[PDB]
Amino acid sequence: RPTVRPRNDVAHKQLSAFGEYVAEILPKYVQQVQVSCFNELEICIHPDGVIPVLTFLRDHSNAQFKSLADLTAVDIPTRQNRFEIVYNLLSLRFNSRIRVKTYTDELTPIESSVPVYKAANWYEREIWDMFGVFFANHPDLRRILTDYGFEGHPFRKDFPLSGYVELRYDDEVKRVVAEPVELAQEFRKFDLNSPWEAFPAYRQPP
């Protein structure tokens, strides 16, 4: 392969040792499922204890990650449990990237990462705004990416892209800017979906 393959796997064997190392501790409280593909590692964590997992990977001698820089969340309605909070972690002394996930429906409150990480609270505000996931024992849960008088959560797949309240006219009122008007221009819903599966091995048995 000259232009076919991006990179050859050589560090993948060494990265697979990490997937065994945390699994050797073996908690039903923490571990569950370990997935590793394309020079990266992914771990999903039981909702009951997230804070003890975040104290791990930080400080530890063999794996010194410490920096819990990026914090994402997945919106998916296929499973019985809806949202999935995904932590993206990076090491500065060790030079490696690892992923931490949660599996619960998280309409009910989830454990916060503020005592472990100082910048995570700002990312926690993003999740509560866009999705509606409350963090227990969180200091100051302020709205950032939402309007001051906004109903619902602006990112959820259950509600339309245009939104319920979005159009703002000045109209007959001298200073008060309107909100209740809901009609917008037509977004063309593309019903395109190609026949035949593009990839082997990804096919699941019914």
Partner: protein, 147 residues
């Protein structure tokens, strides 16, 4: 009769001479709005002097994307402007969202909040095309007060 008709053009000549813009740091359009101050394509004392403060300026240039969080903010700034005021909505975001438009937060076209006199269609609004936004403004000011 003739002195009255020429005096109205003399008042309009002052707006034809100089107009002070507002530094609306609203999006990427504001970066090209800074390129109006950049020497290669200049309106610096050609007819534009940057100073900010909505109370002193004559023309406000809405430079980018407006949201529902920004709709009450921009509205009273236009109200803080002196009564002979002109709004130049520059960019596709200012004309109805670059992409967006069918998005939840973005207000469509500025005209829903504040009325616009001169439209500039350019996403990356090229400084060459931006120069019309002030030159056509001066050309549009033709006649004020008949009686």
């Amino acid at each position: 009769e003739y002195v009255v008709a020429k005096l109205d053009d003399l008042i309009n000549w002052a707006r034809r001479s100089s107009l002070w813009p507002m530094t609306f740091g609203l999006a990427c359009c504001a970066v090209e709005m800074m390129h109006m101050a950049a020497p290669r394509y200049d309106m610096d004392r050609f007819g534009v002097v940057f100073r900010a403060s909505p109370r002193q300026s004559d023309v406000m240039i809405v430079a980018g994307t407006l949201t529902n969080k920004m709709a009450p903010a921009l509205r009273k700034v236009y109200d803080q402007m002196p009564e002979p005021r002109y709004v130049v909505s520059m960019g596709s975001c200012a004309n109805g969202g670059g992409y967006y438009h069918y998005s939840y937060s973005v207000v469509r076209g500025c005209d829903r909040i504040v009325p616009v006199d001169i439209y500039v269609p350019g996403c990356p609004p090229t400084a060459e095309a931006l120069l019309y936004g002030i030159l056509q403004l001066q050309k549009k000011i033709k006649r004020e007060k008949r009686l």
